[PDB]
Design a protein around this ligand. Sequence first.
Ligand SMILES: [Zn+2]
Ligand SMILES: [Zn+2]
Lengths: 43, 43
Amino acid sequence: GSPLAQQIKNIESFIHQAKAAGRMDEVRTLQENLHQLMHEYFQ
Amino acid sequence: SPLAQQIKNIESFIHQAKAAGRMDEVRTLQENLHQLMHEYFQQ
Ligand SMILES: [Zn+2]
Ligand SMILES: [Zn+2]
């Protein structure tokens, strides 16, 4: 429920939706941001 | 073992595999990490 957890959950939703039909195979900006957040939250 | 510890640990291993240019290991570990992330947040 913390803000970092919320931001990770938000990004994950954006990644999955961006990989749905008719959209993308790559989500580089999102993955870069998720990677950064993972290091912030998983201490 | 906590899921949070599993996620922290596997991210270290991903970094190490990347640093060693072990691209198949990176791919495999990243897929496992993605599954773990879902387990953690969906629990
Ligand atoms: Zn996901
Ligand atoms: Zn990392």
